[PDB]
Design an enzyme around this catalytic site. Structure first.
Site, PDB file in Angstrom:
ATOM      1  N   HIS A  61       0.840  -1.177   0.000  1.00  0.00           N
ATOM      2  CA  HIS A  61       0.000   0.000   0.000  1.00  0.00           C
ATOM      3  C   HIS A  61       0.880   1.232   0.000  1.00  0.00           C
ATOM      4  O   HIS A  61       2.115   1.144   0.023  1.00  0.00           O
ATOM      5  CB  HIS A  61      -0.989   0.040   1.186  1.00  0.00           C
ATOM      6  N   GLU A  63       4.911   0.379  -0.109  1.00  0.00           N
ATOM      7  CA  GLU A  63       5.752  -0.249   0.899  1.00  0.00           C
ATOM      8  C   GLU A  63       5.287  -1.693   0.928  1.00  0.00           C
ATOM      9  O   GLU A  63       4.106  -1.959   0.781  1.00  0.00           O
ATOM     10  CB  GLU A  63       5.548   0.375   2.280  1.00  0.00           C
ATOM     11  N   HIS A 115      10.932   0.350  10.794  1.00  0.00           N
ATOM     12  CA  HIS A 115      10.466   1.064  11.964  1.00  0.00           C
ATOM     13  C   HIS A 115      11.617   1.112  12.951  1.00  0.00           C
ATOM     14  O   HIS A 115      12.367   0.143  13.112  1.00  0.00           O
ATOM     15  CB  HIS A 115       9.261   0.350  12.568  1.00  0.00           C
TER      16      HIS A 115
END
Ligand SMILES: [K+]
Ligand SMILES: [K+]
Length: 149
Positions: free
Chosen positions: A49, A95, A136
């Site tokens: 997405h 991603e 992350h």
RNA sequence: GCGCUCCUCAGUACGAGA
RNA sequence: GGAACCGGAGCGC
């Protein structure tokens, strides 16, 4: 090419967040994006997405956010993303989960979807130009940082 | 009928800190 | 990122 990501992971013993180093092959990561379908979050897993990179659908900064610099034109070019990322003139970033072993993430997995881990391969829609691998900073959520290579 | 669990609703609506 | 209502079952009362 070899990319290194630093991901903070919780230790159940010490209960402290510790640094974890993770190596990824770029070839495998690109391969991951090639095999992933070319839709914006329409799989059972929701991957791949749209990776805003701090922008809105009209290619204008969001104010308060700093876009990641991939060092490539198509990639650092402010996005043009419609209601469902299917505009005929749309261009933006996607991603998709990528791991050190390089296996293909099961994008149709759902309830529960496969664990996406901390790292993502970022690339362009619709020509899948490789932009980089981000991850992350801590856990599988929050701020996404550009990894090294 | 009350309490808890799971499925589903649904990766939906909603959203852009994912 | 990401619910709930409605919908179906289990356990206890
Ligand atoms: K529920
Ligand atoms: K219900």
């Amino acid at each position: 090419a070899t990319w290194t990501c630093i991901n903070q992971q919780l230790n159940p013993k010490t209960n402290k967040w510790e640094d974890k180093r993770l190596l990824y092959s770029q070839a495998k990561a690109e391969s991951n994006s090639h095999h992933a379908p070319l839709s914006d979050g329409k799989t059972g897993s929701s991957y791949p997405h749209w990776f805003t990179n701090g922008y809105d659908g009209n290619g204008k900064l969001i104010k308060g956010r700093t876009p990641i610099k991939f060092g490539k034109a198509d990639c650092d070019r402010p996005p043009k993303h419609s209601q469902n990322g299917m505009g005929k003139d749309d261009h933006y970033l996607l991603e998709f989960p990528t791991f050190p072993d390089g296996h293909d993430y099961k994008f149709d997995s759902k309830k529960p979807k496969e664990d996406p881990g901390p790292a993502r391969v970022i690339y362009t829609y619709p020509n899948k130009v490789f932009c980089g691998i981000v991850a992350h900073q801590r856990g599988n959520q929050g701020d996404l940082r550009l990894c090294s290579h």
